[PDB]
Amino acid sequence: SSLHPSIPCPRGHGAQKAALVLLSACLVTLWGLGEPPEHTLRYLVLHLASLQLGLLLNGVCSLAEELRHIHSRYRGSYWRTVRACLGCPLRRGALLLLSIYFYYSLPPFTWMLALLGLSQALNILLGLKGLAPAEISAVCEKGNFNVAHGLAWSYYIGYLRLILPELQARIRTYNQHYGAVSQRLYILLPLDCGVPDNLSMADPNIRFLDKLPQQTGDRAGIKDRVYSNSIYELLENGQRAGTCVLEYATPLQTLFAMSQYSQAGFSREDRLEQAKLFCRTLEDILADAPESQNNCRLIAYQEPSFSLSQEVLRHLRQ
Amino acid sequence: SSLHPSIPCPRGHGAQKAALVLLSACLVTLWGLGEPPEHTLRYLVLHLASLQLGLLLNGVCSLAEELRHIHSRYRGSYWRTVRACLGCPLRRGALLLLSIYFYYSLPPFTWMLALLGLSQALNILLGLKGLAPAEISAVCEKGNFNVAHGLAWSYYIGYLRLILPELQARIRTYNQHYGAVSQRLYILLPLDCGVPDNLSMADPNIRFLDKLPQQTGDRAGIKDRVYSNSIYELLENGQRAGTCVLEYATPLQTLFAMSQYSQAGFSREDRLEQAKLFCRTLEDILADAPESQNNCRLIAYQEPSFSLSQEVLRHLRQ
Amino acid sequence: SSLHPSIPCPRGHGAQKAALVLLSACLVTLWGLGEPPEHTLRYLVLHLASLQLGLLLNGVCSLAEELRHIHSRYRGSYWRTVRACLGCPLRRGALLLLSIYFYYSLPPFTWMLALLGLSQALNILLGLKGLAPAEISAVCEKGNFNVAHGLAWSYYIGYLRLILPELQARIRTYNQHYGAVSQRLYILLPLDCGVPDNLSMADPNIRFLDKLPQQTGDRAGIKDRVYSNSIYELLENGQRAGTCVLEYATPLQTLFAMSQYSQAGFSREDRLEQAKLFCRTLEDILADAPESQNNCRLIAYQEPSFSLSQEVLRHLRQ
Amino acid sequence: SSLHPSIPCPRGHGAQKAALVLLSACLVTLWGLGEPPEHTLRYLVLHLASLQLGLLLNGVCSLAEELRHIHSRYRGSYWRTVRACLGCPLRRGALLLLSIYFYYSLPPFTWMLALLGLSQALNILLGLKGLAPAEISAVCEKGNFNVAHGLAWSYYIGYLRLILPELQARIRTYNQHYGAVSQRLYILLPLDCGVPDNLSMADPNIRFLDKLPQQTGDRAGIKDRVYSNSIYELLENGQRAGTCVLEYATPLQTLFAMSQYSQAGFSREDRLEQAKLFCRTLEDILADAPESQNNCRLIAYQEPSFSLSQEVLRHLRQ
């Protein structure tokens, strides 16, 4: 992540390497103990069979709830609800048959099944099926179950994908009509999600200069919708050092406000996590987007003193 | 939901009721089988201890990966990484001590530990840790891990919270200047995420009249950012049945475009589910908000034969 | 597919159902035979271990060739070549370790390894690794490894996506300037891939009326690239019965000529299969594409006598 | 390939050489072990018989699915459906008879058959039938099952085969009417599939001069379909270094747009591989064609610092 050092990189395969090391150590331990290998295989298979039976029972319990949402969430198809509860029905059925056979055959089935059902019911009722924070985070960032992903794609599809192409023309028109504003959009990404409405409050050096020729278009039934873009001057030691089209990333305001509202269910640590994820997703979207053919420069910063003017000027002078 | 029958209601406690029934049946069958209750207790406790030890080993494997992101995602504290990977360290440690004691005391040990490690490593390496679709959906909808959650909270915080209060004044000004527009903003919510750029194309029975007095504000560094609303005409047999400020919910455009990009990682079933969730979340927010003093009327619909103009007219006739 | 009855539908899960039935029958047979279940498990695990070792050997043989394309096909990364040859290195390594351990432990290893390597070398050298036609077809249609897929996504992204949106304007201009041509593009899809240059040669009834106002645009360094579209009159029993913008699907000409050329390596049975696949892919692309908002009507037909004029007229009058 | 070093050469016989080495080593170690050769022969034959029986069972499972598409994909002949699943019926039957005989004759049987069926059903249901990436790639590039194969052949049959012959005449006419354009069409092949809509944007050193006399013909119902080529000017230090008929290979636009659509099922590594394959296929077809009498010069390049104008100039100076 070239944006900021504090942006987490995507999760790799460290867990798999640790699992391989664990498997090697366990095999070495089994070899050293010198117990009958047939017993090792028998007990491993019996353990996996018990896990499969527990999965079946937990899936039936989940089905008891999911069947209430058949007509709305699952389009009135019982097979779809069963697939949502117990994974692929065919594979799960095959594994369940194998588990039943090998548990009934290998050296009381009904009593062990009763105990297993009791254990699963206890796990469900006491709410012990809660995944660890790291596991939930990995699941969410692998399936794109974040608010930051949706916010970044909203900010790209709705604003950047419609503004970046014509920004060069608007800048050219402004330059001819009147002060050599840089030919790029400088988006500020405060990782603390503190986005003031007027930049001059953020830093005394930043000062409004003038607006750009407005852009117009039809959007979702609201026609003549207009996109403005203010021009600011980077005031250094009293004398202008640069001018650019500065603008905060508005989804960060939504993140902050969501963090502030109780009904949102958004915590302040969730705020930092999702702000960093938004900054990381926007970078990828722009890197793969043809519209950003050297058109914008995402600026991300953390407030520990600090001057936004210096940050923007550093990213500009380069 | 009153919005549309296809909107899924929040998950209840059906799973826990089924778990209670399963537990009662399991206890009844244990009574029927008539085996030493102490043996039942011993094997149940040993099963739970094995589950706890498996959790420990899987958490260590996850720690192997999470430790790489310490300085970025966990703020440099090893305790936070360990907590993320193994829940609460104190409770996990207590249960681990109890499990080890009761495993080594009740009627080998290192052999069972090696087999448990083998099983856990095999589960991780083979990628059998995935959760069923229903469990992932439940976790996401309980922890607010959807894209339709942040999108709804951006739509409210950023457009509606800033437009609804002044809509009465703008409509009053327009009425004085001319026109009997209804004093409410109608937001159409296509569950299929169609949302064309002009309503007339969606239905030739919907015609434009004129815009409202623009509203201007300062937002996230942009000066004089303005919001425009378009008045529309509801014909019926060619005659003006009614007039209102129609508008599409723009986040559905983002949902559609996300579903249309391979980089987004967003599917089409995902699109429908997130659209329904967005409708529900927006309904809840506007139902528990002060701004919505009967200032808006969400309209949701699904394609069948269908005429949008009749839908809006029916909602208006109330 | 509603296009033609002869368009194959996508492959389902019949193989999985047959596999489940086979597994049930085999388990019943094992139960009936009454042999020691421990022996069953031992021999099943040993068979799977032998399969894994054979996979390792075949993957090493494949690596011996793939290592020559490291700098071109695999970006100079040895790990990428190994992952391409032996699948996921970590999972394959874990399974290989387990196979070695259980084959060496459970009731000579080196002799059997030599024999297994001999068998794998014989399979490779004699060219016995040939997948059945059905398996290759399933792999290709699941991973989109067809010429028809690329041709359909070329015909949509290069021609239809730039013609359908603005076709209505050209039709309206032609109508006002001059004969009420239907407001849709009628694409003919000869499943035999026989595409003549002049329609009147295909059928005497098909007669030409006039051209449409040319469309123009800039494409890939060639500007003023024009897209003409002829209008034909449907002549029935001597008198006109309709007029439309009729046109063949030109990628079928590429399919035919490719089948004719020897350097292509394309067969006539391949020609029919790929023509059907192209017709089925274009249907989906248009089904979920916004541009085809009732803009085109794909006509697919199989020659057996036969009148193209009658087919077009049937699809028109409806 | 002479085009670019990144173009992968066709697969050779490295795998078979490695298989020969493996077979020789296995025979040497069998000699070293010095054990009954008849036992070696028996075990080898039995292993091959087990493989054949597994092939039979897997083919029957595949037949269970293929029989549903008999009338569509196999023309209603059960023999063709069986051939598609079990290779050649006669050879498979002969090998099956030999396998059954040698299994029932050499030193139970029904038990081994049931275990083999269990293993095959488990392989199918668990989805372990997938091939390694380097084997799917080999099969596709041997059987011409690539997306780029059809695109290269469409580009040849439809543009080049119809343009190259008359390019000399068109250039002669333009030269007489004015300009010293080189008598060759230069096709740029961006391996990254950039291909912007105007070369000037790609490089400001590439300026347009004028168009060529249009070419007209009849194509698939449409007639007066015109092909236009744009002459471009090759500047150097602001001075015209050369002039040529530049052009991008449009199929790369299709490859890029396919990679950008989720429905296409097309990835980005897929995009790069297919672009390289398209370049190779076009080079081969144009090197073994009569039309290309030095009438074109394919140019391939990769982004690094890099100037397109210098690349084209270097290719022109030859």
Ligand SMILES: Nc1nc(=O)c2ncn([C@@H]3O[C@@H]4COP(=O)(O)O[C@H]5[C@@H](O)[C@H](n6cnc7c(N)ncnc76)O[C@@H]5COP(=O)(O)O[C@@H]3[C@@H]4O)c2[nH]1
């Ligand atoms: N800096 C800046 N200047 C702009 O002109 C602008 N326009 C949009 N955006 C931001 O990019 C994204 C695209 O908006 P989208 O329409 O998809 O959702 C928008 C849209 O559904 C609605 N909305 C906002 N402004 C308008 C508006 N003028 N008219 C109608 N609807 C609006 O409320 C949502 C959130 O808006 P913002 O939360 O302030 O930030 C948006 C958003 O994150 C802008 N950001």
Ligand SMILES: Nc1nc(=O)c2ncn([C@@H]3O[C@@H]4COP(=O)(O)O[C@H]5[C@@H](O)[C@H](n6cnc7c(N)ncnc76)O[C@@H]5COP(=O)(O)O[C@@H]3[C@@H]4O)c2[nH]1
């Ligand atoms: N009926 C019809 N009228 C048209 O104007 C037209 N234009 C394109 N197409 C077809 O759509 C598809 C997309 O074309 P693409 O440009 O991506 O590949 C094209 C393009 O790379 C090149 N080519 C074809 N025509 C031109 C042309 N006039 N100028 C430059 N390049 C061309 O050769 C490829 C194959 O062309 P066709 O195989 O005859 O049919 C094409 C193609 O199947 C048309 N079809």
Ligand SMILES: CC1(C)C(=O)N(Cc2c(F)cccc2Cl)c2cc(C(=O)NCc3c(F)cc(F)cc3F)ccc21
């Ligand atoms: C890997 C190894 C050796 C291991 O560590 N355990 C933990 C364990 C228990 F889980 C249960 C008792 C002792 C031990 Cl020691 C285990 C279990 C089985 C088994 O058959 N479990 C069925 C099963 C039960 F036994 C009790 C129950 F309430 C439900 C249930 F489904 C096989 C192999 C192992």
Ligand SMILES: CC1(C)C(=O)N(Cc2c(F)cccc2Cl)c2cc(C(=O)NCc3c(F)cc(F)cc3F)ccc21
């Ligand atoms: C499922 C069942 C009972 C079965 O049907 N076979 C087929 C078969 C042979 F393949 C080989 C001999 C007899 C039978 Cl009968 C099998 C094999 C093994 C096994 O250990 N194979 C290792 C192995 C070999 F034996 C010979 C070889 F040349 C290489 C090699 F790697 C285990 C269980 C079975």
Ligand SMILES: COc1cc(C(=O)O)ccc1NCc1ccc(C2(C(C)(C)C)OCC(C)(C)CO2)cc1
């Ligand atoms: C993707 O493959 C898997 C998927 C899933 C899942 O869907 O949860 C689980 C497990 C999968 N593979 C691992 C696996 C291990 C053991 C067995 C097996 C034997 C086939 C040897 C006997 O052991 C005992 C058994 C009752 C567990 C079933 O049979 C099968 C599979």
Ligand SMILES: COc1cc(C(=O)O)ccc1NCc1ccc(C2(C(C)(C)C)OCC(C)(C)CO2)cc1
């Ligand atoms: C996705 O899961 C799979 C992937 C692959 C693959 O990558 O080819 C193959 C197999 C996979 N699951 C099925 C499976 C069955 C049995 C075994 C196992 C026991 C775990 C019980 C002992 O026995 C056979 C063994 C000696 C080989 C080692 O392990 C493991 C797995």
